[model samples]
Target chain A: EFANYKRYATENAALAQPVKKEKRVVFMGNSITEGWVRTHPDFFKTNGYIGRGISGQTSYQFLLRFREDVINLSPALVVINAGTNDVAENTGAYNEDYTFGNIASMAELAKANKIKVILTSVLPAAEFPWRREIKDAPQKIQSLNARIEAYAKANKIPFVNYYQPMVVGENKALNPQYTKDGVHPTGEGYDIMEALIKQAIEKAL
Target chain B: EFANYKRYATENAALAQPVKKEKRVVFMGNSITEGWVRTHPDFFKTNGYIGRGISGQTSYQFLLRFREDVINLSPALVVINAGTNDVAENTGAYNEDYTFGNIASMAELAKANKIKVILTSVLPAAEFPWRREIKDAPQKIQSLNARIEAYAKANKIPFVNYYQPMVVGENKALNPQYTKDGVHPTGEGYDIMEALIKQAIEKAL
Candidate 1:
C-alpha cells in the first residue's frame, strides 16, 4: 500500500537506454524536484537532467530508492534535494541524526558507485499546510541544512545552498517572488535554484 | 504520510550506552529478527546482541535505518536478515535490483564503519499468507538468496544460509516442524537459525 518508492521513475530511466557520453544527472528529491521538471520542463529536457522526485517522500525513502533512481541511471552526478518533508515529520518524528544519516548514507553510496554528490538545502518553507501542528519548521529546516553543509564539507562534496538566497527576512519563509506556496518554488524560484545547482554541478565536476 | 522509516528504532539504539568491549552485534531485519529477540530472549540478551527489527518492514527500510540501527550502535558485526518482505512486496512492487541494492548498501555502510558483515538468506516461505497471490515466492526467495550469497562470497563476508536447511520438499516451504504458518519460523526454527548464525559469527570473528 505504501508505494512511494520511485519505481516508475526508475523504469523510465532504464527504458531511455544510456547514450554514449551523455553525462546524465538525476535531480533527486520530494515534490520540489517533482515540480521543478514540470515547471521548468526545458531546463531538464535541454540539460539532460532526469527528475526522480516523488511528492510527499522523505529522505529515507530517497535513500531506499537511491540505487534505482540515482545509481542505476549511471549519472555522473546526483543532486540530492530533500529533508523538508523529514522536518515535517513525514516519516514519524523528525530527528536531525536520522535525516543527516539518510543523506550521508546516500552520499556514501554515490561515492562508492563513482558518482559525485551534490547535497542541497531544502527549499525554504514557513509552514507545511498539510501538517501545520509542528512549530518552528523554518528553524528546523535551517538546522538540517547546517548539518548537511557541515557533512558535505567534511566529505568534500558540494552543498547546494538553496536556503540562503530563498529564505526572506526573520520569518525564514520563501521569497514571495519565488514561491506562491510556502513550500514549493515558482518558475522564478526554480530559475534561481537551477542557477545555483548549475554552479554547484560545475564546481563538483 | 509514509511514516515507516523506523526513526524511533534508531533513536532507541542511540540512547543506549555502549558497554566496554561489548562487541555488540545488531540483528537487522523484519519480523523474523523482531520475533527472534522476543522468542529467544537470551540469544540476544546474554550474547550482547541488539535486535533492530520491525514487523512487515522491507529491505529498504532496514537500509534506511542501518546507520542508526547498526552503525551508530558501533556493533562489531551486523547480521542482516532481509529480502523476504521485499518478495512479499511490503513497500511497493518487488524488484531484484532494489532489494539487493538495499542490502548491498547496508553491507557497504557496515564495511565503511569497520563492522564485520553477515548476510543471511531469507527464511523459507512457499507463500506469504497475507499475500497469497504471489505464488512463486519460493523461487523469488531463492533467487534473492543467491544474490545475497554471491555478494557475500565476493565481498568475503560471512553468509548465513538459513534456507538450505529450513525449507522442506519441492514446495520450498518452511519445515512444518519449524513454523506455525508458511512464513515465520517457530521456536524450533529459531533454534536452527541461532546455531547457524553463531557458527557464522564465530567464523567471521
Candidate 2:
C-alpha cells in the first residue's frame, strides 16, 4: 500500500548508492504512473531513472511519504502526478485547491532540496462504470489538469499534458481503442505517454 | 471570523474583568446559549457568568474558540450547550462523536488547568421550522443526546440534561409554548436551564 511505503528514488535508492553526488530523476505518482513505467521499461532504464510511483495513492497520502521519497534520496528532479485518485473517490471527495495545495507543498519540498519539479496533468477519463453518483467526473478531471498546467507555468516547472492527445472527440470520453477500461491504458497507451514524458523531461532539463 | 483571528482568552478578555482572581465562566455554545445570560440577569448576578456563545455557531466553530474564549481566561468552571445549530444547519451538519470529541478535548484542557467542566445536552426541539430537510427534527436531537449522555457518563463529567424538563411529550419536542420558532426558547425555558446549571454547580462545589 502507498500508505505504508513509498520512495523508490530517495530512501531506498540511497542505501543502494552510497555516493553523496548522484544525479537522479524521480517519477513520483500513483497507479497510472506505475502502470506506464512497468509496461515501458526502455523509458526508465535503471541508471539514475528511479520509479517512485505507488498504486491508488492520493495527494495527501503522497504528502506524508514525500520526505522519505523525494527529500531523503536527494534527486536532481522529481516528476509529480496527483489529483486523479482524489477525484476517483479513493479516500474522500475531490477538492481542487486541496489536491493542488498538496502538490504545491511537495513542489516546495523538492525545491528546498534543490530538486527541479515536473507536474503532470490528470489523465483524461469520461465516466466511470464503478461510480454511479459521479456525474461531472470528466469536467473535474479537465479542471484539475488545467490547474496543474497553470501551476506549472506559474512556478516555471515542466507541465506534462497527457489529456489532449488521448481524449476522444466531442470531449466526452477517452479513445476506447487506446485503453482497456476507458481509464487504464493498454500497452500502446503507455507508449504514447512514455514518449510525452521523455519529451517533457528534455524541456524540463 | 475563526478563519483569520483566533483570539486567546487571556489576550482578549483582560479588560472585561478588572480584578485578576475573579472566577470567569465562559458560556460556550450557539444562539440558544447566546440568549440565555441576557434573558436572565440574576444568573450572572450570583455567578461571574461570561457569555462566549456566538449566534449560528456549530460545535466545530466552538471547538476552535475554546482556548480563545475559555482557556486564556483561566476560568474556574466552563459550561457548554452546542450542536443543535449544527443539526439545524444554522452552520452545518456535524457528526455527534466529532462534537463530543471536541467537547472532550476542551474538557482535557480544563482538567489541565484545574478548571471544572460541564457538558450540556442538546436542548429539545420538536420540529425546527428553520430546517425543512427533515420535518421531524426531534429524532435527530434524541440521537445526538444519546451519544452526549453516554460520553458524559463515561467521562464522569456533570451532564446537564437540558432536554428532560424542557422537552414535551414522548416525541421530545421543546415545549411549544416556550419556544417561538421551536428552536430559541422563552423566559420560562431559560429559567429551567438556569436552575439545572445552579444545581450542577452546587453539586460540583
Candidate 3:
C-alpha cells in the first residue's frame, strides 16, 4: 500500500524476485526478524541470512508486505513469525481463519516461487504486562502456536519449535529465568531462539 | 485506514455501512469521500448523507472500505466517486484494468445490497500539476472517465457526469476557470459538481 512497499515496480517485471537468485536464507517476521540482524549478527553474516521483518505487524499486515519483503527478495528458505500483533489488538482479536488464511497465502506464494518455507513457532511469552487492555494475549499466543505447529507438520514444512524450549510453566510464559519482561528475550532467550531457528534453517536446506 | 479518515471501519462492520432505513444516501469513494464532511457540511445537513470514504485510498482501497462505508451505511441510494488515488497508485495501479476492476467490484457490492447505485464520473483534470510528477494525467483522467461512463450506462445506473462540463478547453484541464488546483475543487468547481450530483440524486430517487 506504500510506494516501494512492493518489490519490482510495474515496469520492472524482469527484476522480479531478485533476492531469490542469491541462494541466501531469509528471515521474515515482525520486529523480531528485523531485529535478528542486530541481535544475532554472527549467525546472519555466517549464513546467507536476510531479515525482512517490519515492526508492529500482524500476519495480515505481513501478508500485505509479503510479496515485496519475502517472495520478491527470493531466498532459498523463508522463516516466518507473525500473529502477535493480531492477538494484541486492543479492541478485538483477529479471526483464526483469516489469520491462518493469510499465513497460508504467504506460504502458497513462497511455495509457488519454489522457496522453502520455515513456519516458526510463536516465540514464547509468559505475558505482556505492558499490554493490560488485552486479556487473552497469553492464550492467543498458545492458540496461534498450536495452529501454526499443526499447519507446519501437516504441510511437512520445517517447524522451528521455539515454544518447547522457551515455555517454562504450564501457562507458557517465557521462562522467567530467561526473560525479564515476560515477553521479549533476554540474552538467554535470544540464544535459545537463535539455536532453534538455526536448526530449522539448516533442516530446510 | 485512519480512524477518522472515513466513516467506514472494517474492524467494526456496523460503522462500515450504517442503515437508516429512510432517505439513505451513501457517499462512496476514497479519502476524498472519507474527508468530504471535512470540506462540505452542507451535504450532511441538507441531505441525509452517509460518508463511506477512507484516506490514502484508491478504488481497491475504497472497495475494502465500502462494506463498512457504503453497504453498511444502508443508504437507499449509493453514489460512487472513487479511483483518483488508484490513478495515483494508492493500491499500486498495475494498470487501468486493475482500477476499473476495483470500481466494478464496488458497484457489484452496491447492487447486491439492493441499493440504487449512481456512478459519478471522474472529475476532469488538465493535469495533476500539483504533484508535478504525473505525466499523461489528462489522458489518465479521460481514460478513467471513459471506462466509468461505459460501466454506468451499461448497468443502467444514474451517471453523474462531472467530467464533460468541468473539462472546459483544449488543454482538457478542469476549466482553470473553476478548479483551484486542477485536481480538487474551488468554490466554482464544487458549485458545478454539487448541481450535477443533486440532479443525479433526484433522478435515482
Docking class of 1: medium
Tens-digit lDDT track for model 1 on A8-65? Answer: 6546645565664787788888899999988889988877788888889888778867
> Which of the numbered candidates is closest to the native, going by highest DockQ?
1
Ordering by DockQ: 1, 3, 2
**Any idea what lDDT model 1 has?**
0.83
Model 1 interface DockQ: 0.52
| Residue A19 alpha-carbon offset, candidate 2, angstroms | 5.8
Better of 1 and 2 by DockQ: 1
After superposition of all CA atoms, the RMSD between model 2 and the true structure is 15.1
Give candidate 2's whole-model lDDT. 0.72
Which residue runs of candidate 2 sit more than 4 Å off their true CA positions? A6-14, A17-22, B1-205
The best-first sequence of candidates by lDDT reads 1, 2, 3
Evaluated at residue B99, the lDDT of candidate 2 is: 55
**Poorest stretch of ten by lDDT in candidate 3 chain A:** A3-12
Model 2 residue A111 lDDT score: 75
Docking class of 2: incorrect
Note the clash tally of each candidate: 0, 2, 14
Q: Runs in model 3 with CA error above 4 Å?
A: A1-22, A90-93, B1-84, B88-205
Off by over 4 Å in 1: A1-7, A10-20, A89-93, A129-135, B1-20, B89-93, B129-133, B180-182
